[PDB]
Design a protein around this ligand. Structure first.
Ligand code: NAG
Ligand code: MAN
Lengths: 49, 305, 422
C-alpha cells in the first residue's frame, strides 16, 4: 500500500507515453497498483494493476 | 431615553448614559425609576472568517461512536516501545503510512525506528528499543538541597542527598545511576527525622504536639518499634546492669519515673570496659549533690556540649 | 535488514537540526562465501494537510493606533507586530511596505517607553504608581520584552536584574510563585496559575539572558508543575501548565501524561472532528473558554502537530466565541500568538528539501529534489561497498529517508541457530 515513484508527462497525442517503470533491487511481491490523475484542475482518476 | 453609546475604549464597557430630562420641573416628587448607566461589554473582531458564520449545536467526549470504518481498510493507533512516545498522534492510520517513534526524556532510539501500517490491521513493528543515555532527578521532597543539582544526570554520575540544618536522611546518602537509576523509594520517600544530636526542641519529638499544652512525653511503649540503638542503664531499687534501646531510655526518664529519676549513659552492648564506669555510678546524691563535671548527667540528657 | 533510517529536519523543527547521516557499511560473520551485500534507499514524507484560514485585515484599521489602560493599549501591538512579520504580508495596504513598517516601529518605541513608566526602582513592575508589588505584572511584562529582543534590542544588565527579584524573593522553596499585591482546597489551583504564568514569561526571556541561577530556578519551577498537576483540578489550570511545560522539555515522561490528560478533556465537533475545543466548567463577554483553548492550541503548536491543531484553528477562526473577551488583552494576545505560531508551522514545512546521497570516500550516487509536486523518491541501488552518507542543503520541510540492506546469510551460521542437522 506504499507509494513508490511518481511521474508527470505532457500529452501531445492523446496517447500519453511514459518512461519505463522498473522493479526495485529488493521488490515487494504481490499485486501492484498504478493510479493516474489529471493534476490541474480535474479530479478524474484511473487505476491499473 | 438612552444616549451616549460609545466606541470601545480604556477598559471599557460602553457607557450609554441616561438623563431624566424629559420632564423638566415640577411640583417635585420626583425623579424616575431605573439605572443611569449600562455599561455593557464591548465587542471586537479581527476577523476575516468570510464569515459567514454558520453554526449548530452538538458535543462529543471522546464520543463512543466508533469512528472506525474497516471498509476503508486502515490501522488503529499503535502501541509504542517501552518508554513510548510516538510523534504525530492519530486515531486511525492509513495503509502504507509509516509513523516514527521517539523516546521520552531521556533515552536514545537504537536501531530502525518506524512503524508501517500493513494491508491487514496490524503493524510491521520493525526492531527498535530505548537505551538510557541519561537518568533524571528523582521527585524526593523539599527537605533537600541535593547535590550535584542538574536537570538530568549522565551514566557514571553519582548524587549525594543530605537533610540540613538538623536531622539526617539516615541513608542512603549517595547513589550512582547506570540505568539502574539508583534505587530511591518513592513510596515511603525519605522524610528526614530530627537527629539525636540536635539540642533544639529535642524533647518535643516525644511530645505530640500538637496536643495538649503541648509537647511533653509519650508512653509506655508507643515510641518503640524504631531502630533504637542500645544503651546500658541502672536504677529503681532493682539495680542490675541491664541494657536498653534508646526508645525506652527517654521513656523511663519522664513524668512517670523521673520523680524516682533514673540512670544512665551507654552506649555499651553490656559489655567490657564501660561497665566499670557504672560502678562508679553509685555516687549520685551522696553525700549532698553531684558537682564533678557532667556528674549531674546534665538534666535533660544532652551531648553534653 | 533495514537496520537504519532517519528523518531529515532542515529547520530543526523537532528538537535539534538534522541534515547529515552516515550509514555505516558493516560485514556480519554469518555472511555466505562470495556473494555480496546489496542496499536500497528511498525518501518520502511531509504533505501538510490544510492551508486553512488567516487573520486581520480589519484589525489594522480597527485596533493599531485605532488611564491605566495604557498597558492594555500598547500590549497587543507587540503581538500584532509579530504576526505581520511571520505572515510576512505588509502588502495589503495601499502604502509602500517600508512606509508602514517604519510607522509601526514608532508605536513599539512608545510601547517600550509606556512600559518603562511601570518599572519601580526595585526593578520590578507595578500597576498603579508603584504603591504595591505584584509578581503577575512582573511576569506578564517579561513576555512582551522577550518579543522585542527578536526585533530591535534590549540591554541585558537592565533586563537581567528583573529576573533575579523573582528568584531572590518571590520563588518559594516548594517551587511555587506568589504575589504581594492583594474552601481550603482552592489555594492549590491559584498557586499553579501563578507558577505557570511566571514560567512562561521567564522562559521567553531566558534565551536572551542565560543565567545559571535562573536556569536552576526553571528546574524547580517546571518540576513543581509536573508533580502537582497529577490530579485533575481545572481545564484552564491544566491548559496554562501544559503550555508552560510545552516551552520546556516536551519529551518529559510526566509531560506526556499531562498532555494526554489534556487531550481527554478536549471537546470536538464531528466524526472526524471539524472543530476541537476545551471547556473549563464541568456540568455548567461571558466566554472564558477562549483562553484554555488558546493555551491548548499553543501547546500543540509547540508540539509541532498540524493534525491536532487544524480543528482548533477552525474553531478560533469562526465560532460562537463572539467576542466577548477580557482582560483584555490577556485573552486576545494568546489568540494572536496562536495564529502567529500557526502561520509559522505551515510555513515551517514546505518540503523544499534537496537531498544528496553520496558515498563517504566515493562520488555522489544520486540526488533527490523534493517539492510539493514530488514528495516521493525512487529506490536507488547501493552496490559498491563503502560508507553511505546522505546530506541536505538549507531547504524547508520534513522528510524521512529509509535504507535497507539485503544480505544473503548462511545457515552454515548454526553457531547462531544452535542446531546440528543431518
Ligand atoms: C550517702 O550519705 C548518707 C550519709 O549518712 C548515707 O547514710 C547514705 O547511705 C549515702 N547515700 C546513698 C544514696 O547511698
Ligand atoms: C432606552 O431604552 C428603551 C427600552 O429600554 C428604548 O426605547 C430606547 O431606544 C433606549 O435604548
Amino acid at each position: 500500500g506504499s507509494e513508490v515513484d511518481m511521474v508527470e508527462e505532457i500529452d501531445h497525442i492523446g496517447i500519453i507515453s511514459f518512461p519505463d517503470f522498473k522493479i526495485p533491487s529488493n521488490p515487494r511481491y504481490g499485486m501492484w497498483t498504478i493510479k493516474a490523475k489529471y493534476k490541474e484542475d480535474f479530479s478524474t482518476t484511473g487505476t491499473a494493476y | 431615553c438612552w444616549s451616549s453609546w460609545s466606541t470601545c475604549d480604556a477598559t471599557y464597557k460602553r457607557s450609554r448614559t441616561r438623563e431624566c430630562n424629559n420632564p423638566a420641573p415640577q411640583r417635585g416628587g420626583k425623579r424616575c425609576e431605573g439605572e443611569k448607566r449600562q455599561e455593557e461589554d464591548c465587542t471586537f473582531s479581527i476577523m476575516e472568517n468570510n464569515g459567514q458564520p454558520c453554526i449548530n449545536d452538538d458535543e462529543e467526549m471522546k464520543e463512543v461512536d466508533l469512528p472506525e470504518i474497516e471498509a476503508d481498510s486502515g490501522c488503529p493507533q499503535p502501541v509504542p516501545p517501552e518508554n513510548g512516545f510516538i510523534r504525530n498522534e492519530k486515531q486511525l492510520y492509513l495503509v502504507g503510512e509509516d509513523v516514527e517513534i521517539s523516546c521520552l526524556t531521556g533515552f536514545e532510539t537504537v536501531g530502525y525506528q518506524y512503524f508501517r501500517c500493513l494491508p491487514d490491521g496490524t503493524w510491521r513493528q520493525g526492531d527498535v528499543e530505548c537505551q538510557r543515555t541519561e537518568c533524571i532527578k528523582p521527585v524526593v521532597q523539599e527537605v533537600l538541597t541535593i547535590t550535584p543539582f542538574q536537570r538530568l544526570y549522565r551514566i557514571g554520575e553519582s548524587i549525594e542527598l543530605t537533610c540540613p540544618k538538623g536531622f539526617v536522611v539516615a541513608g542512603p546518602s549517595r547513589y550512582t545511576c547506570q540505568g539502574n537509576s539508583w534505587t530511591p523509594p518513592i513510596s515511603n520517600s525519605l522524610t528526614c527525622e530530627k537527629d539525636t544530636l540536635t539540642k533544639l526542641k529535642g524533647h518535643c519529638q516525644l511530645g505530640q504536639k500538637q496536643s495538649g499544652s503541648e509537647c511533653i512525653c509519650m508512653s509506655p511503649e508507643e515510641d518503640c518499634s524504631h531502630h533504637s540503638e542500645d544503651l546500658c542503664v541502672f536504677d529503681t531499687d532493682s539495680n542490675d546492669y541491664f541494657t536498653s534501646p534508646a526508645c525506652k531510655f527517654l521513656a523511663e526518664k519522664c513524668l512517670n519515673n523521673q520523680q524516682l529519676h533514673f540512670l544512665h549513659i551507654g552506649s555499651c552492648q553490656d559489655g567490657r570496659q564501660l561497665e566499670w564506669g557504672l560502678e562508679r555510678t553509685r555516687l549520685s546524691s551522696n553525700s549532698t549533690k553531684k558537682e564533678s563535671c557532667g556528674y549531674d548527667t546534665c538534666y535533660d540528657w544532652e551531648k553534653c556540649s | 535488514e533495514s537496520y537504519s533510517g532517519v528523518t531529515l529536519d532542515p529547520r530543526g523543527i523537532y528538537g535539534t537540526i538534522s541534515r547529515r547521516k552516515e550509514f555505516p557499511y558493516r560485514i556480519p560473520l554469518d555472511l555466505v562465501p562470495k556473494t555480496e551485500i546489496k542496499r536500497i534507499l528511498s525518501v518520502k514524507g511531509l504533505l501538510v494537510g490544510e492551508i486553512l484560514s488567516a487573520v486581520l485585515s480589519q484589525e489594522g484599521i480597527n485596533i493599531l493606533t485605532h488611564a491605566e489602560a495604557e498597558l492594555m493599549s500598547v500590549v497587543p501591538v507587540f503581538y500584532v507586530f509579530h504576526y505581520l512579520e511571520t505572515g510576512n504580508h505588509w502588502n495589503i495596504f495601499h502604502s509602500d511596505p517600508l512606509i508602514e513598517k517604519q510607522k509601526l516601529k514608532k508605536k513599539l518605541k512608545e510601547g517600550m517607553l509606556s512600559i518603562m513608566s511601570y518599572r519601580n526602582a526595585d526593578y520590578s513592575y507595578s500597576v498603579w504608581k508603584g504603591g504595591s508589588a505584584s509578581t503577575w505584572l512582573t511576569a506578564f511584562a517579561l513576555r512582551v520584552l522577550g518579543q522585542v529582543n527578536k526585533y530591535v534590542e534590549q540591554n541585558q544588565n537592565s533586563i537581567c536584574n528583573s529576573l533575579l527579584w523573582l528568584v531572590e524573593n518571590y520563588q518559594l522553596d516548594n517551587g511555587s510563585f506568589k504575589e504581594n499585591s492583594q474552601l481550603p482546597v482552592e489555594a492549590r489551583e491559584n498557586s499553579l496559575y501563578l507558577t505557570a504564568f511566571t514560567v512562561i514569561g521567564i522562559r521567553k526571556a531566558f534565551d536572551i539572558c542565560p543565567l545559571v541561577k535562573i536556569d536552576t530556578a526553571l528546574i524547580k519551577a517546571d518540576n513543581f508543575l509536573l508533580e502537582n498537576t497529577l490530579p485533575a483540578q481545572s481545564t484552564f489550570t491544566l491548559a496554562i501548565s501544559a503550555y508552560a511545560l510545552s516551552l520546556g522539555d516536551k519529551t518529559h515522561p510526566q509531560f506526556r501524561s499531562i498532555v494526554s490528560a489534556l487531550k481527554r478533556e478536549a471537546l470536538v465537533k464531528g466524526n472526524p472532528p471539524i472543530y476541537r475545543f476545551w471547556k473549563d466548567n464541568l456540568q455548567h463577554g461571558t466566554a472564558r473558554m477562549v483562553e484554555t483553548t488558546a493555551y491548548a492550541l499553543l501547546t500543540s503548536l509547540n508540539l509541532k502537530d498540524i493534525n491536532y491543531v487544524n480543528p482548533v484553528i477552525k474553531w478560533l477562526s469562526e465560532e460562537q466565541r463572539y467576542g466577548g473577551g477580557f482582560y483584555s488583552t490577556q485573552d486576545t494576545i494568546n489568540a494572536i500568538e496562536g495564529l502567529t505560531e500557526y502561520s509559522l508551522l505551515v510555513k515551517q514545512l514546505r518540503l523544499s528539501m534537496d537531498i544528496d546521497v553520496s558515498y563517504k570516500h566515493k562520488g555522489a550516487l544520486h540526488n533527490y529534489k523534493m517539492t510539493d509536486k514530488n514528495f516521493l523518491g525512487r529506490p536507488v541501488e547501493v552496490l559498491l561497498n563503502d560508507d553511505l552518507i546522505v546530506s541536505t542543503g538549507f531547504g524547508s520541510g520534513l522528510a524521512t529517508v529509509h535504507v535497507t540492506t539485503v544480505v544473503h546469510k548462511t545457515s552454515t551460521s548454526e553457531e547462531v541457530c544452535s542446531f546440528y542437522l543431518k
